[PDB]
Design a protein around this ligand. Structure first.
Ligand code: ID1
Ligand code: ID1
Lengths: 243, 242
């Protein structure tokens, strides 16, 4: 009853002819739920979900002064139009602006990046590859359950970076809020290395509880990117976490 | 700097209401209102006072953080959401007066008076004890003075810790999606005429911030939804939100 398998959630994947895992962690009850215990512990490239620890490290080291500091567009036109403009940390997270985060990684450098991921206990802690692309096509690997462990430390300000760094990244993770819930989260789509997968990791703040979540799914084409959030919400709805 | 647009009066008249909306375009440093006179008239702050109260409680360590639980005193009050344990996030969301009265008592009148003066928040001539003055009319503030105060909080320029300001801005979170974030606080004042509703806060866009402060006559609790509805009709008219 610590970690419970609910195979009924597979219907939310099979409805879309898809396969994946959703992991939930009920913070008040200290109980975890997943449709697939094995896939819940399978490690993948973090892709854009790495923007969480990258943001934290950049802030703690003063590579990023605050969430208002402007990162000037380098004038190279890329396939994603929202990237071809100046950004701050809020918009860089919202639009997953890779080039901004690659520049952070170069200024952090390999020695500080490696040490800080070890201090974070982050996935396999392995930065092997390019200092500015290892989370896209390098050695780093993290499971859904390891995303939850990391996110629980961030939520509680327990990572070995400044409280201020943690509050700024949690602000930048803000995705959705209304009168029922707040979602702080980060999407990712890993396409450089097989298998192509989509992530959504974060948490749902309720009045008197927090539900952490980490989901990934097979994403052979960009068609189904909306399924990351739609399937997670169908699970949260089934479990009565959100109306 | 401050422009009167009487066309926004229609957003009030359509609902047989009277009030003021003030907008502040942060990038352009320009303000807009339907009524310059009312924009500068001071009203009881009611629950909008929970912003400075929260800041002072955090800065002094009366509130440790936004997770600290304030236990229900077991007395049933007529707002059901009050009758339960709260933290700073839910105390703000549900405007839990008794929690804020206890903060005020621990802050004490000397520290409360000094901190409100440093904030430039409301009239300097405050009558009433520390747990009642903001409820009973010892303090008043205008829509334009709400904007000035909110702009200082947004920029972490108030004379409290940066941390205190970030925690209150987190607690002000009201609505967010892919188009905008609203950080704001509702108020409803019924102790002294005119009974009024407030909504003060801001709209964070990708590339700008629009500060807002609205109050309106609220003769019954039936109209409380109009505080947000009228503000959003104005934000929609000005193309600030879709
Ligand atoms: C992060 O995981 C991604 C980065 C590494 O490219 C971004 C890219 C988008 S998918 C939209 C790209 N269009 C494809 N045709 C993304 C996401 O939606 O999660 N994260
Ligand atoms: C803030 O403006 C408060 C919320 C609930 O609207 C409001 C509560 C009252 S005291 C309790 C009144 N009793 C029944 N509702 C209050 C005030 O007096 O300033 N503000």
């Amino acid at each position: 009853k610590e970690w419970q398998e609910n195979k009924s959630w597979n219907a939310h994947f099979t409805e879309h002819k898809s396969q994946g895992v959703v992991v939930l962690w009920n913070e008040n009850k200290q109980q975890g739920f997943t449709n697939n215990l094995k896939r819940a512990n399978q490690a993948f490239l973090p892709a854009s979900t790495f923007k969480i620890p990258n943001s934290l490290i950049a802030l703690d080291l003063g590579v990023v002064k605050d969430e208002h500091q402007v990162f000037k567009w380098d004038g190279q036109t890329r396939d994603i139009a929202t990237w071809n403009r100046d950004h701050n940390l809020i918009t860089a997270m919202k639009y997953s602006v890779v080039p901004v985060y690659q520049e952070f990684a170069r200024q952090i450098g390999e020695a500080r990046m490696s040490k800080m991921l070890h201090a974070f206990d982050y996935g396999n802690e392995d930065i092997s590859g390019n200092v500015d692309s290892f989370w896209l096509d390098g050695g780093i690997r993290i499971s859904a359950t390891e995303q939850i462990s990391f996110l629980r430390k961030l939520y509680h300000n327990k990572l070995h970076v400044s409280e201020r760094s943690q509050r700024i990244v949690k602000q930048a993770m803000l995705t959705e809020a209304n009168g029922d819930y707040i979602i702080r989260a980060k999407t990712g789509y890993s396409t450089r290395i097989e298998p192509k997968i989509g992530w959504w990791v974060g948490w749902v703040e309720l009045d008197d509880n927090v539900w952490f979540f980490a989901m990934n799914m097979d994403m052979p084409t960009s068609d189904g990117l909306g399924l990351r959030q739609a399937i997670t919400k169908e699970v949260l709805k089934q479990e009565k976490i959100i109306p």
